[PDB]
Amino acid sequence: SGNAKIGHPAPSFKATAVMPDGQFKDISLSDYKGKYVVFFFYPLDFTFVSPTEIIAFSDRAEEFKKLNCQVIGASVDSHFCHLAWINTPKKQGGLGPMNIPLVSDPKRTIAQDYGVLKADEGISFRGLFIIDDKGILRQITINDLPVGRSVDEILRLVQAFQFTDKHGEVCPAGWKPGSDTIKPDVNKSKEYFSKQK
Template sequence: MAFAAPSTMLSSSASASALSRKSTTPMAFSQTLAVPRAFNGLRRSSHRSRPSRALSARAPSSKRTFVVSASSEAPLVGNTAPDFEAEAVFDQEFIKVKLSEYIGKKYVILFFYPLDFTFVCPTEITAFSDRHAEFEKLNTEILGVSIDSVFSHLAWVQTDRKSGGLGDLNYPLISDVTKSISKSYGVLIPDQGIALRGLFIIDKEGVIQHSTINNLAIGRSVDETMRTLQALQYVQDNPDEVCPAGWKPGEKSMKPDPKLSKDYFAASD
């Protein structure tokens, strides 16, 4: 199968749920296989559970907090991540993955991709797998999700990377054949039945702290995901500080105060 990607890119760090209502840009989806900017989908191909931490630290009540606590009607960021239980492929076996089993234990990077056996998707999936050990050191698990079956996932994992496959992965690939998970995270394109490239960082308390959603033709950055995770963990460990643009571990943070923030600006070039 092939489809042409829409011309716009959707990227958000706050309003994932609104997206499900607005992602109406149509994409041509044909039985044939020919699209330069998107990709094709083949399918076909085998159950165990495997999971990923820091508490969503809240600033003391006497201080102003910069942590958003959203209502269920608000954007997904700041809300408890929708729980799910689904079949997945890991270590070439079929397993069960339940998001709530990670709560209180690990951070989770949950990312959605459109289809197996496509073009941009394997570059993202393998890139996250190759960096899995780095996320593990940050007490974080990675979970990939698409609307394909576990049989399709297994076949893709059993295909060599040089042939467009994934090879062995260091994290589970979840099957969302009912499309219920994609819908609950606001990334499902209803008329196409596939998900946009949504990525969510969920903290140890099960709260979504970050989301980004790309259109189909644009791959995501593992480096930026790592940097955002590190910034999140830093501010949760230091609730009286915030991270400025492009902050990385070891760099100067900022006090969210009109007077104290001047120390940061004064030290800047």
């Protein structure tokens, strides 16, 4: 969990990234205070699972946008290496044009802060972080190096967390838009448990 604890302000940071239009702007998590943010880390540039999951995100970038949610990727590689990677063709193992910002963390501080730094390699694991509109860490997901994440599950989550923040109800197990939620009140909750069995 590093220094990022769920329920608390997510570790801040200011890094150089590759915007969805080429060119290098200095992005800060803080610049998004007001929008949800799916900040995810991936191992190394020019590897395998990575391009598959980072492309999967850029492509669906719109779906997240319709949720006032800004996705943001990051690795320990330099921005120059990031650019070179996006220019590389997909069929060739590259990312190709991106609709998502890609952050570089060559100090590995952003990594240490989020506790996803595989020290023995100076690499970061497949950590994903869902921090909300106010800056509070709401979900954290880490996978070992051989297994990619699921944009769908991560979408489900954001919607989920966005619901609760505005309805004072809680999302039962495996909730999805339309599913039954429940009132977190000893009495009021029985209106949910009752219609179960």
